[PDB]
Design a protein around this ligand. Structure first.
Ligand SMILES: [Mg+2]
Ligand SMILES: [Mg+2]
Lengths: 239, 239, 239, 239
């Protein structure tokens, strides 16, 4: 149970972030979600329920990250899920897109953590969950920059675990494999796509399955888990 | 919730195995625990409650493992926690102790899994959790054989995940760091031991904290987690 | 032997880069080294000998990286060693320093690789060696940004290996542990510092020892090695 | 150069072990190779040349390992390459074959190392190279036991590095991917097999390519490399 804990989920208006926020609100946390669009943000907060609230934020804009930290200054659980993921071969990758990818995926999260963790350390407790990707642990053509930004987060998980752990603050990564919102038709039919067919479990994850690993690491159930990567990928890393 | 699921925990009469069994019984599983001593085994089963039952077994004895599989043939959750852990330098290690360590920690678990997983695959669902150790991922003098047996389990986690995953059977490892049953006095005083002082969290784990990671991987909450290692070590692997 | 091969070493005027360039020139490569200072650059090139030449370059400046690629367009061996490494706690880390660290350590190397690898792929052979650090695999307080930039390189090693390997181009990382230029007095005396005392080998590396791993991966001796990390750290990662 | 060093290669009469021994003899080492068959052993020793000598040994027989250590008691380089590799699904795996696999691949090497390393530590220098496999790091159906034995060696690499490193003795693993002795016809034709087609380099390794990594780690060039795994697999681990 997360009663009395405040959980901030960046990029929490859809996908993995939305379902992570939904689970934590249903467990009694006071949830704050962020996203770029105010209308979808308010609808996402109403979808989560339980008093969840929306704060508009652009993680690639440090002025916006500053205002986000100012509006949610005291945070016990922080899920760093906001990010972009455009693909291109190394030979095709443009400079503008490279800079945006690192500014949004790494720079914004870094200084948001720097602010939020200061309060956690002063209070003597907290849990930070970085969302990464299997592309940060294996090589997938087209994902060089995206994978590199999330590999930076994997290392920051370890450094932050060492820097904050003496004050009871845990830091971990959740590394998702292929994930897709299930459609109404997907319990029907027989076709298996090439992506799923490569994984031991022979299917893609629904976002809610990734969110269960986030909830675990965020919660006091994982009280002795820190500095680590939890792979939620149907076996992708193991093969 | 684990209602309607049968969970077998080898070495479930004390420590991590006892607390893993306690959590799963409290979540509605029909729990079977094993151990070498019948008196402590029955007392452990009564301590767990919820209809948990004891089956005497010696994992280093294949006749005993055969009888264990015969007495608990249909198993949805299998926690491979039974094991011995005597320490010695490589130069001091004796042949008898080496053979016992691998026969008990690896051989018994291997063929128990071979039997139990056959039923899981036929039914299309199951979860297997191997208990390993930080000594299988980092080098600790005195733990050469013990660490090697649990490293064998870490690889078997990956091979079994690949072999059983197409039929909905998941396999993962829980790698515990320093763990100690807390005493009544341990919230008092100021002394910090050298073991704890090396970990980011600056403390040792209670067995119940390791068991929470076992419960997570055993349960449908980890439905997309397979082939992986969950480190529960206060940051030991990350530093 | 590297006769007929051109090897570019960024940051090759001191330390690991200088000694990597020295070894490759002594093995017959046409060596190009880069660095920020023209006077030290020319002295370093004369120290290496064997026709090694200097090209001034600032990896944090894309105009300079463009001119570097223009001046050394056809490259068979590329050692990405240029980088900065200022330390600070996450709470003390400034925005300016963060941006400089990623622009220099990641952005410059990324687009230099994008240019150099295009020629390697067209020719059907090449070897790229990224210099990283143990701080990208374990958590060391004060090294959050530095470790994160080199973790990005570790992931790029894997993605580039997948993207370039079909055309015979190999990509690997060398991850150095504690390294220090030996002094004349260091074979004398008895004192052992705390840094060395934590490593299995109980000493720090001379840069020439790191360079031997670079030479191996750069050379045809490592013809089947790609996508991997070679740890040169006295055992630091293993403990 | 390995002049004045004695190198013992178990299973050195064919494949990776033969080519590792050939390289070290050509670099001036006094090479001893082992194998089960005396006739092929003497022909292999004559093929290597340079005074290489054969000692018959069965690593699955501790009496034979004792005699091997007695006949080659003072060893500076030890390459643990002897091993068997029969495949079977976990459901098909027999008890006899399991026991033979661990006795040969793990038990024999363990106590051979225990004897040889004692002399290395007393002398203050030595290098031990364990041959493992990609199947010890990723899950491949049919390789459960084989992969598990070599994963035990990977952990022993780390523990031995910690136990022997203070006395200047290094221990590392070489993890080979798909390897095949090239045939005379293989530079001709166009067909690419499924095994090669999965690797970034799109080919299988010749044993001599694995041996180059063994020579590197065995030699003083790798003077600061210990406790680590060198992957020689065409990119297999990275994808
Ligand atoms: Mg910028
Ligand atoms: Mg036996």
């Amino acid at each position: 149970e997360l009663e009395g804990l405040t959980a901030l989920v960046t990029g929490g208006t859809s996908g993995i972030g939305l379902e992570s926020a939904r689970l934590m609100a249903a467990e009694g946390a006071d949830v704050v979600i962020t996203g770029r669009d105010a209308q979808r943000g308010e609808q996402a907060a109403a979808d989560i329920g339980h008093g969840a609230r929306f704060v508009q934020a652009d993680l690639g804009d440090l002025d916006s990250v500053a205002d986000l930290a100012a509006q949610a200054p005291d945070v016990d659980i922080l899920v760093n899920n906001a990010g972009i993921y455009p693909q291109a071969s190394t030979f095709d990758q443009d400079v503008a897109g490279f800079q945006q990818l690192f500014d949004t995926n790494v720079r914004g999260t870094y200084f948001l953590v720097a602010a939020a963790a200061k309060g956690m350390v002063a209070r003597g407790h907290g849990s930070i969950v970085n969302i990464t990707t299997l592309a940060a642990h294996k090589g997938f053509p087209g994902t060089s920059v995206y994978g590199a930004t999330k590999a930076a987060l994997e290392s920051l998980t370890r450094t932050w675990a060492a820097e904050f752990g003496a004050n009871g603050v845990r830091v971990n990564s959740v590394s998702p494999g292929p994930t897709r919102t299930p459609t109404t038709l997907e319990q029907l039919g027989d076709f298996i796509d090439d992506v799923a067919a490569g994984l031991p479990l022979r299917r893609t994850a629904a976002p809610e399955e990734i969110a269960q690993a986030v909830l675990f690491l965020a919660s006091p159930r994982a009280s002795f888990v820190t500095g680590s990567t939890l792979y939620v990928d149907g076996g992708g890393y193991a093969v």
